[PDB]
Design a protein around this ligand. Structure first.
Ligand SMILES: CCCCCCCCCCCCCCCC(=O)O
Ligand SMILES: CCCCCCCCCCCCCCCC(=O)O
Ligand SMILES: CCCCCCCCCCCCCCCC(=O)O
Ligand SMILES: *C(=O)CCCCCCCCCCCCC
Ligand SMILES: *C(=O)CCCCCCCCCCCCC
Ligand SMILES: *C(=O)CCCCCCCCCCCCC
Lengths: 238, 269, 55, 256, 269, 60, 269, 55, 60, 55, 125
């Protein structure tokens, strides 16, 4: 009869506890393992994979493959804005439903760099240069290419290498950021501008499309696990 | 741990870490250091909380039913499935095949019921939860011989105590639990289609070993599942559309994301 | 027959198991192994960053 | 004198050339092979036809239009009627294979477009009518491409697959299909996509009629376009080759 | 573990592993490798869950009775036998002689009873379970001196606590428990016939140490048996016919199996 | 007074649990063993034995 | 330990340990030995109980709310802040930045409520406390799917047991918790001003898993915070004025100290 | 005086007993010993598979 | 089933107790430390610092 | 893997931890480290007691 | 797998890619650098902003027409209003810089033309 004494916490069921429980099926022989391809070991192996970003949310294109297409056209001037969305991988309607944004919605904090791979889907005869830029928060979003200028940019020349990767660094006051929005934890703006208008020959289409892909860099990490707001339920499914 | 950034300076070469051909089906590995001048930063950040075990290993309620002190509903039964709850089902469905051990915790709670019954003075209720593997005899009443559990495993738990918990092995016939199944049960490509052709875990019955009082009492057993020692293969897109059935992929089409106005709008609408 | 392992930090925690079945054991929270070049880069011919992808 | 753009794949009687391509995307980093004595259950000795089964089977061509939503081909069922792959598949209870999927589509310098060529392991699809499950004749199309829908399929009292491309008939986001081994056929830089799929399944061998373990999907993300004069009929031809096919459990022929 | 299959090829000899003479009373040892071309397969399958200990070592309810707060049934008594329950009895009867230790768990549950009694406010009930080995004095009332258990073992258990449990040795006089007995108790081949001539384990009495309240309360003691450290000899055919008595083999004849139509019918009817 | 803390599962009776219980009969001397023929050690020793199959179920 | 006094004798030099210039912003280090003849004393006095851990590491109630058996208030919610209680808030505010682990103990207590309801005979109440990190779905009713806690952590506790307790890590984004913040949340120096721009710990919901009886019952959850493994930087003046708000420094001016009469009055008035 | 034995797998679990009686001990779940040639083949003269049973 | 026996003090919550509690957030990675100036280690480091004394309490 | 440390006096107390997280550990009551010359004397040039502060 | 046609120049926040080009023509064979103690006169210590000043400033685009004669941009004055290069330039009496001038113009295979991109030291007009 060993003298024991209980501490607060006895007979409590903590959802996230880690204890040993007696097996209900003793000496049960588990069917031997099999090497099945593509095993996941960490959720970041999945967030490091490019997934097409629905930049053109706009209207009913969200109910289509058009959400995925970024319209590019031959103008009568350069410096025009192609697109613009804020750096909120788990919050912005653009990123929230990406492979990266879905995983990020199960966590409260996040930290790291992100790769935005842009692929030009025009004719093999179309040319053009684009200014892909990321401007940290502090002063509003760049409204001219001349304001996007001063930011962290990458001039993309369309050629044989269809795609160009604008890599967004981690420039933050804090170590992590909230997955949900908070202006303390503000992220910045990603904009695209024509550097030199789209030039096409005669008989080739002048309006093309670009596609954007989002993946995490080797320094990306998510913290504090919570439930996604993306899956609801009214009754047990039957 | 997470990778530290290397101190980078200017560049003027024909090396193009930024230009690629995404058609290859290969994700680019560009890092800040490649498209800008970086400073050296030492990353101590850890990807510990995003391992598959930490993601899935948390008790989730998968279902719950009620049984009573008197009447018709005197015992309950549930054919085991993790698909009746939106929350846990969706996490498991990030992977095509998953393999794991389970930790079962049950939260059994009773409520006194409205009656004209006078002089109620309940005695402590003890419950019996019994598992009937696919093939064994099923309780047809609160008192069929079946509840002897001479070979079936079953938990007897008296109210007011700590929640009954036990763990279970990887009970599958396959070398991994199949989360999806693009097939039928009959070789004639007929019968059932989908994962239900595979679900055969048996039933779970619960009952009051004793009625306890003269007045009515209704109990509600909540079953919690916690995947311990998890292995997951072949990842897939998280569920977009809401779940409609507990036995099939049936969804009602929904748009890719929510909307905003112009491709230039820095704000969700 | 105990096992002293490390705690999660930014010490040790001794552990002994009492059950005859491995299924009765605690979760495996400390496996930070990882390999994204199954999904990122599942290409047959190697792709070097600094070089043109299509040549 | 080399080029990352050139290729030649020889399997059996068939050889395949490409003068414009990307790498060969190898399954989940796994190249197909045979079943090991360690992972085997079926005790009977297998038939491994070799050159007769593991060769290039070119199914029917399909037309890429400015309005095509996409297409899909279940995998064991596509070649289920083709040559000796289809025969062994009928006489045998169990089977196991991997594939070298070569999707071909050539346009010109004045044409544009971009297709996603994925290999979805276990593409369990949904029904238009929420209560039912699609019919075998609605999900499957032997060597004849089954096609996605431009807009939502009506939920009457059918067993129609819910084909809206943007949900891929699986209730997911079509833009995340990129996790499954894939390639793109951007008409600007590409000419074809090659994907070498290893055997993906939770059991060492499975029946080839009752279960279609992989589903090939060709969904155009950026539509075909061209100025007038530019040739209008742009076909897509699918060539699949079984790899390391074994068959256990011989009996009479069929499925029932 | 289970035996792996050997890779076999064709054959054309006078060796006949398939032809035998089953009259010898010897079971053939043919394996797939002998009548076909086999592939090498490595069997990791284990016969762990079919050992006699795992088969029999699970708590089964063997009997249960009731006693009350007031009235005539104020204490209960049960002459110990594992033969009153169909489930555990049938498993033990796979063997002629069995030898083992026992683990006794009791699930005592009370229910308030209907009364006109006003102002009921029960106090906690404590129960006493007492074993009277063959020969000792038996309780003739809830209060006979017998309940002192100065030498008899007995468990005192207060409601709301964990189920009273204790283990017992191999209490037999013989070097094994006899499950069957083709004999009599009298040398004149008379008197009792069968296993009852052997059953002499004594009685088990239970009672409420206290009444607790002014209203009526009825309790139900469920006795669970779990054979630990088991040894079983001389196996036999599992019971086909249903059990009729708790003291004898008495059965009512039933057919060999269920039926189907023609010997060619691939389906049960 | 050693500081302890209970985990869910306390005071639960699992039919298939495997714990130590106090003996109700202390220092009890068990009747010595005897070698009895045909001991079963695994149920598969029994399933490996031929038994006549009722193929002609048919009717009565 | 504390420093012992040195035996001192008379002095007559130009060494002036007593005369200084306090304008330097340096505290003088004079000790009794310097301005008088001291005796040697050995100090065994220890400053153990004044370490920051001992000061802060004691459970303090930080807040408490109520929820009911029936009606509107059936579940509770609290946005986490240590600033609603005067006591613990003031201790933490002796420092500008603090970093620590937390130990949460909850004291959940129920009270039967007045009703005309006859024949009440309550069943044991089990409570669920759930944490919703900033961003997760929030319970909009006692029964929204949200309470499944498939990924959110939550405690299920049955009444009459020991107080539910668990510890939490240093959950901040910054390398220390900021107790004060002289800034805004918007770069336009607008929006929120002060510490609330920083508080984003999420919400805490509690509910009765079961109603238990026919009559009304109201519960009161008391949340206790205990800073374990504490680190505190940049100390500051203890709070003089009383607290007015839980989100800001807002105080109502009060005098430096209490009063007495003449500067010569040896007694408080 | 503990005993570390193996768990059932596809580790170890230390065990100590507290009771003075062997009857108070846990079940013996890990005895996979077996001998079907008591029942299968209880013949006096050996019967070889490849040979004719009756010669 | 190890024979235990509780001593007075069980299931009591002492405000100043010092026990181990299970973490509600497992394998959680804490944001790395930073050297911030002027760390306090004992409250006497603060009481050793001169502070102006309000000698002329007197009245208002 | 235990740790025997000293008790507060005017003995020892053995300790083992059971949890995998350092946050689950007991408080650190025995750290009597101290350094008031951050606050008392944060002056750049050293100030000696026996000498005139301003010279 | 290389090409004389591909390029990537990283300076500060900015990176510049080219998929068709000639070599980089380096000034008079001289690559820009800082002033030596041997060649210095101003005795005060300089401000060398680095990543803030020496980065890619993309001025306004101009349209090449079938009738355009040419264009010219003076050098310190062009970036005199751009970012921190323009700021330091205003607060300081003396300054010294070199440049990486990237003129961009893409047409197609059916377009023709040819521009002279010069850097005239001291273009006194
Ligand atoms: C009292 C004993 C209770 C035993 C509980 C057994 C529960 C079995 C759990 C099976 C787990 C998840 C499996 C999904 C099955 C499938 O779709 O293949
Ligand atoms: C409170 C102490 C209770 C002791 C319980 C003693 C029960 C004895 C069990 C005997 C076991 C099975 C024997 C069948 C006997 C026979 O037919 O020979
Ligand atoms: C059931 C899980 C409950 C989890 C309890 C989590 C409570 C978080 C405590 C945060 C602590 C003190 C912080 C003040 C925050 C700030 O102002 O920055
Ligand atoms: C290896 O464990 C030897 C050291 C033993 C330390 C005492 C064990 C504490 C109680 C363990 C009993 C196991 C419970 C089944
Ligand atoms: C061999 O056991 C020496 C090691 C002892 C480890 C501590 C034992 C834990 C408690 C055991 C007491 C026995 C109960 C009757
Ligand atoms: C180092 O600890 C070896 C000595 C072990 C002494 C017995 C431990 C007592 C019980 C510990 C189990 C840990 C609880 C998770």
């Amino acid at each position: 009869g060993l003298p024991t004494m209980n501490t607060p916490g006895s007979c409590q069921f903590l959802t996230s506890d880690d204890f040993q429980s007696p097996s209900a099926m003793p000496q049960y022989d588990v069917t031997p393992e099999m090497r099945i391809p593509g095993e996941v070991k960490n959720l970041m192996e999945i967030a490091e994979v490019d997934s097409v970003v629905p930049v053109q949310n706009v209207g009913e294109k969200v109910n289509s493959m058009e959400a995925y297409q970024i319209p590019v056209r031959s103008n009568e001037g350069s410096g025009t804005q192609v697109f613009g969305f804020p750096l909120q991988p788990g919050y912005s309607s653009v990123f929230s439903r990406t492979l990266l944004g879905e995983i990020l919605n199960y966590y409260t904090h996040w930290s790291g760099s992100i790769k935005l791979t842009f692929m030009f889907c025009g004719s093999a005869m179309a040319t053009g240069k684009f200014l892909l830029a990321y401007s940290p928060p502090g002063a509003g979003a760049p409204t001219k290419r001349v304001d996007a200028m001063l930011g962290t940019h990458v001039v993309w020349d369309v050629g044989l290498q269809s795609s160009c990767v604008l890599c967004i660094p981690w420039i933050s006051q804090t170590h992590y950021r909230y997955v949900a929005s908070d202006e303390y934890t503000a992220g910045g703006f990603i904009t695209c501008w024509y550097q030199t208008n789209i030039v096409v020959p005669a008989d080739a289409q002048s309006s093309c499309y670009i596609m954007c892909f989002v993946s995490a860099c080797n320094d990306f990490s998510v913290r504090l696990l919570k439930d996604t707001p993306f899956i609801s339920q009214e009754n047990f499914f039957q | 741990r997470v990778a530290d950034t290397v101190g980078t300076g200017p560049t003027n070469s024909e090396a193009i870490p930024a230009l690629t051909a995404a058609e290859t089906g290969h994700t680019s590995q560009v890092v800040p250091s490649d498209t800008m001048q970086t400073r050296h930063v030492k990353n101590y950040h850890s990807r510990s909380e995003s391992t598959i075990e930490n993601f899935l290993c948390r008790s989730a309620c998968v279902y719950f039913t009620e049984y009573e002190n008197s009447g018709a509903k005197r015992y309950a039964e549930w054919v085991i499935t993790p698909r009746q709850a939106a929350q846990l089902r969706r996490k498991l469905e990030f992977f095509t095949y998953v393999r794991f051990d389970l930790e079962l915790t049950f939260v059994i709670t009773s409520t006194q019921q409205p009656s004209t019954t006078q002089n109620q003075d309940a005695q402590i209720l003890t419950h019996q939860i019994m598992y009937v593997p696919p093939g064994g005899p099923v309780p047809d009443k609160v008192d069929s011989y079946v509840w002897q559990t001479s070979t079936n495993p079953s938990v007897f738990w008296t109210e007011g105590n700590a929640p009954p918990r036990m763990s279970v092995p990887f009970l599958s016939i396959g070398n991994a639990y199949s989360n999806f199944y693009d097939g039928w049960s009959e070789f004639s490509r007929n019968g059932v289609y989908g994962i239900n052709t595979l679900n055969n875990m048996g039933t779970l019955y619960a009952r009051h070993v004793n009625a306890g009082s003269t007045g009515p009492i209704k109990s509600t057993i909540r079953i919690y599942f916690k995947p311990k020692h998890v292995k997951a293969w072949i990842p897939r897109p998280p569920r977009l559309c809401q779940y409609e059935k507990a036995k099939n992929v049936n969804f009602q089409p929904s748009g890719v994301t929510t909307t905003r106005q112009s491709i230039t709008t820095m704000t969700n609408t | 027959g105990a096992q002293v392992s490390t705690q999660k930090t930014g010490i040790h925690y001794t552990n002994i198991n009492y059950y005859k079945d491995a299924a009765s054991n605690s979760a495996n929270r400390q496996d930070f192994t990882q390999d994204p070049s199954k999904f990122t880069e599942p290409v047959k011919d190697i792709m070097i960053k600094s070089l043109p992808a299509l040549n | 004198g080399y080029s990352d753009r050139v290729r030649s794949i020889t399997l059996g009687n068939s050889t395949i050339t490409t003068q414009e391509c990307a790498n060969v995307v190898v399954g989940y980093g796994v190249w197909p092979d045979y079943l090991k004595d360690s992972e085997a259950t079926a005790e009977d000795q297998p038939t491994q036809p070799d050159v007769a089964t593991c060769r290039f089977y070119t199914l029917d061509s399909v037309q890429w239009q400015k309005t095509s939503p996409g297409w899909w081909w279940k995998l064991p069922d596509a070649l289920s009627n083709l040559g000796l792959f289809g025969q062994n598949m009928q006489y045998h209870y169990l089977g196991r294979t991997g594939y070298t999927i070569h999707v071909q589509c050539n346009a010109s310098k004045f044409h544009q477009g971009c297709l996603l060529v994925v290999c979805v392991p276990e593409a369990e699809m949904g029904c238009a009518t929420l209560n039912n499950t699609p019919s075998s004749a609605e999900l499957l199309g032997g060597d004849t491409a089954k096609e996605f829908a431009d807009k939502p399929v009506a939920s009457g009292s059918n067993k129609l697959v819910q084909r809206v491309v943007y949900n891929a008939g699986m209730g997911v986001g079509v833009g995340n299909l990129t996790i499954f081994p894939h390639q793109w056929i951007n008409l600007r830089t590409n000419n074809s996509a090659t994907i070498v799929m290893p055997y993906t399944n939770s059991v060492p061998m499975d029946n080839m009629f009752r279960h279609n373990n992989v589903t090939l999907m060709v969904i155009p993300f950026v539509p075909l376009d061209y100025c007038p004069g530019s040739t209008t009929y742009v076909p897509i031809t699918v060539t699949i080759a079984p790899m390391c096919a074994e068959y256990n459990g011989l009996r009479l022929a069929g499925h029932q």
